[PDB]
Design a binder for this molecule. Structure first.
Ligand SMILES: */C=C/C(=O)Nc1cccc(Nc2nc(Nc3ccc(N4CCN(C(C)=O)CC4)cc3OC)ncc2C(F)(F)F)c1
Length: 307
């Protein structure tokens, strides 16, 4: 029942790209801002380069798994892997997203973020997630931190590090114990290590909550061990001040105990899209009207660089 995965994995010469400056640091890897020039193509492509420290064979296995997933996705609302460089250190080359992660963007820019941007971001994430479902991909780590901003107008889902691809036959994926973001997790996943597209939907609800609260941490001041019981009791994240009941009810649905009664991503696209048509009706934000948000000769965005 499973179709062949015919995605190309592109191997890139080290010489083809130059790191310009560091973006983020981890012992495991450091992401770099960079320029990519395909050999003799006359284009420059802004990129983010993730290269691992001097690191374990296991570390190299995980990075390759990430590369496999990223190579296999092509959607406007998903980040895609441009290629990999097989140096002494393995490097993932990705499209640069100039405005960084969405979680940082909302926190930084709250005073200038209108209802239209929020509702639109919600539609875009739903579109990306729906695409992943079409691809039978369960992301397993959806969060504001894992959404990137190409422009304030355009966002893409990222971080396929925990991402798992379902067999056509099998709905659910059962996970060996590993470090997890409980606060974004569905209850069934927390209790049983069970992940589904519907479980992704619970995560989406939390992500929406994060955007509506302009980057607040969910269940702040509460230990992860506690969270499972709290949900069991029936506690849920509080309605955000900007949110109307219409928006909030959607989040609540995402957090329902019965996974099937939760909304489909395709539905989420429809509902948010209607709201986006008249944003002030569904999100109440002070001063909504006033706010506005944002050799290079041969530079081309990755989205415009095809094969
Ligand atoms: C939610 C935090 C987060 O994801 N941070 C982060 C940091 C570094 C790389 C990535 N991944 C990434 N980023 C970008 N584009 C991008 C990200 C961050 C920044 N910053 C971060 C803060 N800065 C400083 C100096 O502290 C500068 C601006 C800038 C930037 O582009 C300019 N593009 C792609 C990735 C990818 F994920 F690796 F692909 C995330």
């Amino acid at each position: 029942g499973e179709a062949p995965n015919q995605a190309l994995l592109r191997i890139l010469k080290e010489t083809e790209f130059k790191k310009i400056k560091v973006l983020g640091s981890g012992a495991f890897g450091t992401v770099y801002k960079g320029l990519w020039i395909p050999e003799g193509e006359k284009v420059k492509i802004p990129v983010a380069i993730k290269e691992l420290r001097a690191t374990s064979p296991k570390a190299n296995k995980e990075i390759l798994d990430e590369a496999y997933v990223m190579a296999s996705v092509d959607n406007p609302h998903v980040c895609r892997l441009l290629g990999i460089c097989l140096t002494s250190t393995v490097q993932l080359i990705m499209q640069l997203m100039p405005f960084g992660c969405l979680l940082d963007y909302v926190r930084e820019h709250k005073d200038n973020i209108g209802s239209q941007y929020l509702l639109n971001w919600c539609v875009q994430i739903a579109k990306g997630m729906n695409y992943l479902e079409d691809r039978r991909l369960v992301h397993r780590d959806l969060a504001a931190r894992n959404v990137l901003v190409k422009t304030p107008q355009h966002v893409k889902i990222t971080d396929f590090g925990l991402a798992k691809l379902l067999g056509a036959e099998e709905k659910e994926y059962h996970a060996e114990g590993g470090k997890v973001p409980i606060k974004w997790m569905a209850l069934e996943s927390i209790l049983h290590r069970i992940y589904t597209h519907q479980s992704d939907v619970w995560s989406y609800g939390v992500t929406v909550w994060e955007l509506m609260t302009f980057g607040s941490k969910p269940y702040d001041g509460i230990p992860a061990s506690e969270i499972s019981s709290i949900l069991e009791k029936g506690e849920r994240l509080p309605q955000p001040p900007i949110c109307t009941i219409d928006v909030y009810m959607i989040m609540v649905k995402c957090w329902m105990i019965d996974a099937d009664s939760r909304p489909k991503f395709r539905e989420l696209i429809i509902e948010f899209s209607k709201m986006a048509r008249d944003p002030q009706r569904y999100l109440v934000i002070q001063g909504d009207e006033r706010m506005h948000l944002p050799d290079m000769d041969d530079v081309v965005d990755a989205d415009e660089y095809l094969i």
